């Protein structure tokens, strides 16, 4: 997250860290949202590489023991059938991860709240992106969970030629684009929390930014619109 600030620890209890086995340890690669005690929602591209993955719930500092973490391996992976690694702009950047075991829910580990099917936010809706991604282009991962206020940019504006053009689809949510705040490498798969009627819900799954950089004016961070995949998520979980 570029232009953000350290989140209060465990203030986003559904945020998870998706990591792959790296040598004798593990390396954070993406964010994710815990949606069931044994299911995590993330971006499809986060699992394009068939590596060994694990999820860390209740995490805050990736390199320090916070006393609130739980580590669970990713057992099964279900990627949206329409996802095409060669065309992220086509959309469908979403995948569900079934965990090896169910994590224990507490104050640090909570199920993410999702929006009702089909809900689309009005322009400039209040949201926050969270994650351990880079805080600057060419930088390193953030050690502590970061958050940045990223108001939405509606489809009409976001899909305009000045912004993303047709690259952005109605199945996506845009947010930010002021050239200062944005998601960055390491934030993919993570949530875009938006406040609606007193409750923060995960309306987006971090997907991409401009090829020109993370924080680029008129190139808001783009997220998969969670509300467009409610039935898909339920079908996958129900198929157990």
């Amino acid at each position: 997250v570029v232009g953000g600030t350290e989140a209060q620890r465990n203030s986003w209890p559904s945020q998870i860290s998706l990591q792959y086995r790296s040598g004798s340890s593990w390396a954070h690669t993406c964010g994710g949202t815990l949606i069931r005690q044994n299911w995590v929602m993330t971006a499809a591209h986060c699992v394009d590489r068939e590596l060994t993955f694990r999820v860390v719930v209740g995490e805050h500092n990736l390199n320090q023991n916070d006393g609130t973490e739980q580590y669970v391996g990713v057992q099964k992976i279900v990627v949206h059938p329409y996802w095409n690694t060669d065309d992220v702009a086509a959309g469908y950047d979403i995948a569900l991860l079934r965990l090896a075991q169910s994590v224990t829910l507490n104050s640090y580990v909570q199920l993410g709240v999702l929006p009702r099917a089909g809900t689309i936010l009005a322009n400039n809706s209040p949201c926050y992106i969270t994650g351990w991604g880079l805080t600057r282009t060419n930088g390193q991962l953030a050690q502590t969970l970061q958050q940045a206020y990223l108001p939405t940019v509606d489809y009409a504006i976001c899909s305009s030629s000045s912004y993303w053009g047709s690259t952005v689809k109605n199945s996506m949510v845009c947010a930010g684009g002021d050239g200062v705040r944005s998601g960055c490498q390491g934030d993919s798969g993570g949530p875009l929390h938006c406040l609606v009627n007193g409750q923060y819900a995960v309306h987006g799954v971090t997907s991409f930014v401009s090829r020109l950089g993370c924080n680029v004016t008129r190139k808001p961070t783009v997220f998969t619109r969670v509300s467009a995949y409610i039935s898909w998520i339920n079908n996958v979980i129900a198929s157990n």
């Binding site: 790296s22 390396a27 954070h28 690669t29 993406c30 971006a43 591209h45 986060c46 394009d48 590489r49 690694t85 992220v88 702009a89 991604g133 880079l134 282009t137 060419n138 991962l141 690259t167 998601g183 960055c184 490498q185 390491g186 934030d187 993919s188 798969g189 971090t206 997907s207 991409f208 930014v209 401009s210 090829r211 993370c214 961070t221 783009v222």
Partner: peptide, 28 residues
């Protein structure tokens, strides 16, 4: 576009979409 996953790489083709492999060995 360039995806926001943090991953090691050896060449630009190892990175997704329009992302390139930085001299530090990571996509961006």
């Amino acid at each position: 576009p360039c995806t926001l996953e943090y991953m090691r790489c050896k060449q630009d083709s190892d990175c997704l979409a329009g992302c390139v492999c930085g001299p530090n060995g990571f996509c961006g």
